[PDB]
Amino acid sequence: MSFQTLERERTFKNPPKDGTSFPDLQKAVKPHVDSFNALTNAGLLNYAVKEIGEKCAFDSITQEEGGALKFGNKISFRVDEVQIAKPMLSSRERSSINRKVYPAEARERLTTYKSRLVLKFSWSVNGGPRQSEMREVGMIPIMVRSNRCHLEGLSPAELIAHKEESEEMGGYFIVNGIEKLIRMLILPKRNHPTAIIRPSFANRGTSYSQYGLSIRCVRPDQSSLTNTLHYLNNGVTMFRFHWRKNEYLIPSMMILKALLETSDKEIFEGIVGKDLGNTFLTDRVELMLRAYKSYGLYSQTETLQYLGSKFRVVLGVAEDLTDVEVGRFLLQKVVLVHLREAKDKFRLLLFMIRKLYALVAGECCADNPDSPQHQEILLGGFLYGQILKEKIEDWLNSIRAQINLDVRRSAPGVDFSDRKYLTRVFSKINNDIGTKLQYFLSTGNLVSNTGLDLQQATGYTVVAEKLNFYRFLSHFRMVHRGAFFAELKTTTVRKLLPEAWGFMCPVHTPDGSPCGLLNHLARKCEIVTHPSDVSQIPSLLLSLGVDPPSVVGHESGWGCVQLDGKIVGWCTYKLAKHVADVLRLMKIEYAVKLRNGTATEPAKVPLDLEIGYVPPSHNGQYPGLYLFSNPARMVRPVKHISTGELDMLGPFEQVYMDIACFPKEIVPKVSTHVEYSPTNVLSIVANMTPFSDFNQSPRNMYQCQMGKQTMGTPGTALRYRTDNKLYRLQTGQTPVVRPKLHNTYGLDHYPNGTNAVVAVISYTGYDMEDAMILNKSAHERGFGYGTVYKGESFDLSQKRRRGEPVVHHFGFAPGSTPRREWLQKLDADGLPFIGIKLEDGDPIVAYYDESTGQNFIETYHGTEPGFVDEVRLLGNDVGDSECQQIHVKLRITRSPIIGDKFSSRHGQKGICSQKWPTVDMPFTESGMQPDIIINPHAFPSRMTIGMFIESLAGKAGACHGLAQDSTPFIYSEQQTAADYFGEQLVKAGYNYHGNEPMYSGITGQEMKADIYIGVVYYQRLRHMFQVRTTGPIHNLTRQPVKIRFGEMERDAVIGHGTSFLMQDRLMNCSDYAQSWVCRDCGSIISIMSTISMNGVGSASEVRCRSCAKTSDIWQDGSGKKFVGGTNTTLIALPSVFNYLTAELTAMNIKMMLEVK
């Protein structure tokens, strides 16, 4: 492979008008963007609002023995649908062509990127009116590039027509200007009953035990709620769940007989109907039926009414209607919300308690919720829709509450037929929610009356920190488990349990405390987000050899098949595996058809569906076929080996699949799948690593974590970036050694370092302890040239607290103006010259008050010479606003200075120590000086052998002109890449071991030993002093205001036994003071200098008040004569002790220190 130059040039020169040149990137960000689309389209929100329902309000007449407390004027209202239009221009007309607002502008004017939000409100007057009307409830953000922005479908060309870079990605909501983002978080698996064993159960429900079973059941609008099965020691199971952030425990048997008009014999024959008289299952089930019988009732309706009458309070249901319908409300709304047919819910509850008991007796191994097996992902658009629906419902409940209080006062206006009344109440409630979503996206704090079945409730959003492009992408693709486990330091999930191969990268993970917690996805692993119809799945299963029974069609060796939480049939495990194989085969075959010319019918068997065939084994997972078609699942591709076609599966079949790593590794008759490539196991940044399969893994880990913090280009369209701090390096080039995907992924458009002439040699003596040297000449010649962009804005509204209108205006009050600094910097508008050098004590901008008519000023907080590259007059609003916001983008220069950090792409960080003179440097027989000298004392104990490999490869590819490919897991132990490059280089003419004979720069005569020289890719970091002789002292305690010395240092100095040094550093240098004391009374505050004795005469000899009562006598500042209190002396002591005495006197407790 060669560097695509003519491609790159005839790319840049003419931006493509067809489409994005780098589809892999758009695919890499595909999660969030498709989340947004599936939100707006794909009938997602309409499902949420429909399954919200409607709210009723009326005039309640108390029953007062009536039993049916009557009420006539009942209004039941609901929203028909949600309409999200494009973000028009600040909609209200401004006498201009009302156009759209591209997000670039929302970045510029530093404003959130919002679009109007419309509801279709519907009525009912307890008749059948149900007329409609649209209600605006504010404006909510929109994500970039998404299905409701003006940037989707756009080619890089018109993206350049706007001020977004050629390869815009989208994926962040622009709030206030700052790129916010919703992180991907891991949840358990959807709707699959998981087994659980955890001690935390038993200590709370003491009759319970750690044995348990749960399921996170989810509605069609993706609104999951959980409900756990608690197997208690007596034998019954409690049906835990959550509502109003509160746990609730109702006996399983209760809800069972309440679910279906069922006879207890039907229960017993469903639960254990098999192997008649299985000891454990029989006796436990009996105990359960009996313990419920103890108190419960018999028929279904009695239990329904009892339940409704028991739970009518926490329910926000219609108060007046009835009581049994309350129970049905429960049974429909909480128990198993994913399902709809009560009989089917009942069958599954049976299967669930059956599996639970099997787990009780060790007949099934414990499911691991701490494993990507039992886990799926939350997207952004999905949680966005869920919280949106939540606010919808709170809005409905608020307006219902307003109608209710409207009735309740006496009868101010009570006419649920006049639309005028509805207008009045609509105005009565706060009709903006868009600010609520914008608020959360700014904060992340999920303020909900219900946790939405989510452990943690804070920190839900990250900011798309564009410091570096890798930081960018990694921000998109990272996932996290939640600080609820971070507070827990254990050998728990923080471990890399080996179900991630090809799913989430092994090495790509920060170090420190959040090490292991947050892991990024692998390279190719996608998340299916668009479900499909599966009706032909039960049809095909029925035709295939299973059947759903009505009376128990179940026996011993028969396994159960699950369609994403719906029992559909049974078959022996041989039939189970055969069904699994034939079904995937149908899926793949119809896939290769629909992809190509073959007609694309509604897919019989779509690719997304995962066939979790679980073979049986003792003390293993509860065996059972498990078909899943739910979206939001981890799904990765490989090649099915029987055919030659694509194959997709998730982290449920992995643990049971023999997928070969290599076409070479396959052993026939068993291995049924082959990896596309081992590449497909790593993440993006970790994959973009020369010979990453060589260095000891911690090096690669530092490599990812630090390379995400590099001083490269953060993009191309910088001119219109309103960020706080960006970083750009001036002279960039692609590496000589690279993995191919660095060209594929279009990384040619964000170089992050250059290619240095590295020579490993212990020559100078300054480069130990990992240190490094920088050739002076190569440095002045334009080496890694750091350029910081620090962009500050100023705004006048903040200093307009209240009471007055806009008063300040930028510029100068007409008349006088300071020239000594201001007119030299400020142009005339109070705004500085474009490109004028500033310093610290320097005005930046000038506004004056109107009333006072005096000029104010703004100084440069920063403490390094900065210029100004551009100033921006932000239109404050829609229009008709004076310029109340200005934006200055200061450019700071940071050449490579002593004390800054460099690092190759192997975690080999170094520090610019001395910038050696270019002539005192050694040289090759060709003579070019080593631009960078590193030490040989860095490679042992760091195992960075891939560094040497990269070095040799660079030395070769540079000479020949080759873009050395270094993809991991190509070179075998047969021929080492060492030998391959050794051929390359011996062809170049250089040494085969990379050595080269060098002459000492300082002595001139050659070294006894050849020296290792190559061409590494070096990027610069950005992580890179306060003197205080004296200064301000504190207000209270006269301390130098906020360097630290003490409280561990004290141990040090007293360890040396060096008292004078201690009293010197901590008393003398800190706070030294003279104060008098009354020697007799021993108090330090009753002292006072005597007052007005005579003329200047002698000194005013201080005296004591406590020790007191013509020359001896004296007076007071108020004139009170006194006498005595003579014995007074002067003592040195730190003033902070004086402060202590003060605040201790404030307690009436005081010490009486004496003196000699």
**Which parts of 41-70 interact with other proteins (CB under 8 A)?**
none
| CB contact at 8 A, 518 and 416 | no
Residue facing Zn ion at closest CB distance: 1107
Q: In DSSP terms, which residues pair with 1020 in a beta bridge?
A: 902
Residue 342 interacts with, from Zn ion, other proteins, none (CB under 5-8 Å by kind)? none
Amino acid at 249: L
Shortest reach from residue 1030's CB to other proteins, in Å: 33
1061 contacts other proteins (rule: CB under 8 A)? no
835 contacts other proteins (rule: CB under 8 A)? yes
DSSP structure string for 335-387: TTTT---HHHHHHHHHHHHHHHHHHHTTSSPPP-SSSGGGEEEE-HHHHHHHH
Query: Residue 604 or residue 779: which is nearer to other proteins going by CB?
Result: 779
Query: Residue 160 or residue 561: which is nearer to other proteins going by CB?
Result: 160
Stretch that binds Zn ion, among 206-214, 380-388, 977-985, 1071-1079 (CB under 5 A): 1071-1079
Residue 355 interacts with, from other proteins, Zn ion, none (CB under 5-8 Å by kind)? none
Query: Binding pattern to Zn ion, positions 1078-1097, x when CB under 5 A?
Result: x--x----------------
- The CA-atom distances, in angstroms, between 981 and each of 528, 761, 924 are 42, 21, 20
513-572: which residues touch other proteins (CB under 8 A)? none
Q: Which residues contact residue 665 at a Cβ distance below 8 angstroms, ignoring those fewer than 6 apart?
A: 671
For 828, the enclosing helix (H) or strand (E) is: none
Q: Return the SS3 of 254.
A: helix
| CB contact at 8 A, 995 and 1011 | yes
Based on the number of CB atoms within 10 Å of its own CB, is 623 exposed (0-12), middle (13-18) or buried (19 or more)? middle
* C-alpha–C-alpha distance, residues 778 and 782, integer Å: 7
φ, ψ for residue 1147 (rounded to 5)?
Answer: -110, 5
Q: Which residues contact residue 786 at a Cβ distance below 8 angstroms, ignoring those fewer than 6 apart?
A: 711, 727, 729, 893, 894, 895, 896, 900, 1020, 1022
Residue 1078 interacts with, from other proteins, Zn ion, none (CB under 5-8 Å by kind)? Zn ion
759 contacts Zn ion (rule: CB under 5 A)? no
Q: Which residues contact residue 546 at a Cβ distance below 8 angstroms, ignoring those fewer than 6 apart?
A: 561, 568, 569, 570, 571, 575, 579
From candidates 28, 56, 151, 160, binder to other proteins by CB under 8 A = 160
Residue 996 interacts with, from other proteins, Zn ion, none (CB under 5-8 Å by kind)? none
82-101: which residues touch other proteins (CB under 8 A)? 94, 96-97, 99
Query: Residue 372 or residue 994: which is nearer to other proteins going by CB?
Result: 994
Residue 1107 interacts with, from other proteins, Zn ion, none (CB under 5-8 Å by kind)? Zn ion
783-812: which residues touch other proteins (CB under 8 A)? 783, 809-811
749-788: which residues touch other proteins (CB under 8 A)? 749, 751, 754-757, 775, 777-783
Query: Binding pattern to other proteins, positions 1122-1141, x when CB under 8 A?
Result: --------------------
Ramachandran category for residue 564: left, alpha or beta (phi over 0 → left; psi -120 to 50 → alpha): left
**Closest Cα to residue 609, out of 571, 556, 647, 642?**
647
* C-alpha–C-alpha distance, residues 346 and 353, integer Å: 11
871 contacts other proteins (rule: CB under 8 A)? yes
Based on the number of CB atoms within 10 Å of its own CB, is 96 exposed (0-12), middle (13-18) or buried (19 or more)? exposed
Shortest reach from residue 715's CB to other proteins, in Å: 10
Residue 488 interacts with, from other proteins, Zn ion, none (CB under 5-8 Å by kind)? none
Q: Please name the residue that has the structure tokens 């097996």.
A: 373
Q: Return the SS3 of 1055.
A: helix
Query: Residue 123 or residue 750: which is nearer to other proteins going by CB?
Result: 750
Q: Return the SS3 of 647.
A: strand
Amino acid at 1065: R
867 contacts other proteins (rule: CB under 8 A)? yes
Give the torsion sign (CA, 1106, 1112, 1113, 1115).
negative
Shortest reach from residue 13's CB to other proteins, in Å: 6
Shortest reach from residue 1144's CB to Zn ion, in Å: 18
Query: Residue 182 or residue 1104: which is nearer to Zn ion going by CB?
Result: 1104
736 contacts Zn ion (rule: CB under 5 A)? no
Shortest reach from residue 774's CB to Zn ion, in Å: 15
From candidates 17, 27, 837, 987, binder to other proteins by CB under 8 A = 837
Query: Residue 84 or residue 1108: which is nearer to Zn ion going by CB?
Result: 1108
Query: Binding pattern to other proteins, positions 704-723, x when CB under 8 A?
Result: ---------x--xxxxx---
Query: Residue 1021 or residue 1107: which is nearer to Zn ion going by CB?
Result: 1107
Torsion of the alpha carbons at 809, 813, 814 and 818, rounded to the nearest 10: -130
* C-alpha–C-alpha distance, residues 58 and 951, integer Å: 81
582 contacts other proteins (rule: CB under 8 A)? no
* C-alpha–C-alpha distance, residues 110 and 793, integer Å: 9
* C-alpha–C-alpha distance, residues 218 and 631, integer Å: 11
Shortest reach from residue 770's CB to other proteins, in Å: 22
Neighbours of 371 (CB within 10 A): 16
897-936: which residues touch other proteins (CB under 8 A)? 926, 928-929, 931
Neighbours of 532 (CB within 10 A): 15
Neighbours of 592 (CB within 10 A): 13
What tokens does 896 get?
């490579």
From candidates 1106, 1126, 1138, 1145, binder to Zn ion by CB under 5 A = 1106
Residue 879 interacts with, from other proteins, Zn ion, none (CB under 5-8 Å by kind)? other proteins
158 contacts other proteins (rule: CB under 8 A)? no
Q: In DSSP terms, which residues pair with 375 in a beta bridge?
A: 188
Shortest reach from residue 931's CB to Zn ion, in Å: 8
What tokens does 1004 get?
């001139």
921 contacts Zn ion (rule: CB under 5 A)? no
Shortest reach from residue 911's CB to Zn ion, in Å: 24
Q: In DSSP terms, which residues pair with 625 in a beta bridge?
A: 561
Cα-only R_g, the chain: 38
Q: Which residues contact residue 200 at a Cβ distance below 8 angstroms, ignoring those fewer than 6 apart?
A: 210
Residue 783 interacts with, from other proteins, Zn ion, none (CB under 5-8 Å by kind)? other proteins
Query: Binding pattern to other proteins, positions 957-996, x when CB under 8 A?
Result: -xxxxxx---------------------------------
Query: Binding pattern to Zn ion, positions 551-590, x when CB under 5 A?
Result: ----------------------------------------
108 contacts other proteins (rule: CB under 8 A)? yes
Total number of residues binding Zn ion (CB under 5 A)? 6
* C-alpha–C-alpha distance, residues 1013 and 1003, integer Å: 20
* C-alpha–C-alpha distance, residues 168 and 158, integer Å: 11
1104 contacts Zn ion (rule: CB under 5 A)? yes
From candidates 451, 879, 899, 1032, binder to other proteins by CB under 8 A = 879
938-957: which residues touch other proteins (CB under 8 A)? 954-955
664 contacts other proteins (rule: CB under 8 A)? no
From candidates 59, 105, 849, 864, binder to other proteins by CB under 8 A = 105
From candidates 732, 1040, 1082, 1124, binder to other proteins by CB under 8 A = 732
Residue 809 interacts with, from other proteins, Zn ion, none (CB under 5-8 Å by kind)? other proteins
* C-alpha–C-alpha distance, residues 7 and 519, integer Å: 35
- The CA-atom distances, in angstroms, between 368 and each of 493, 522, 629 are 10, 21, 21
4-43: which residues touch other proteins (CB under 8 A)? 5-6, 8-9, 12-13, 15
Query: Residue 152 or residue 827: which is nearer to other proteins going by CB?
Result: 827
Q: Which residues bind Zn ion (CB under 5 A)?
A: 1078, 1081, 1104, 1106-1107, 1125
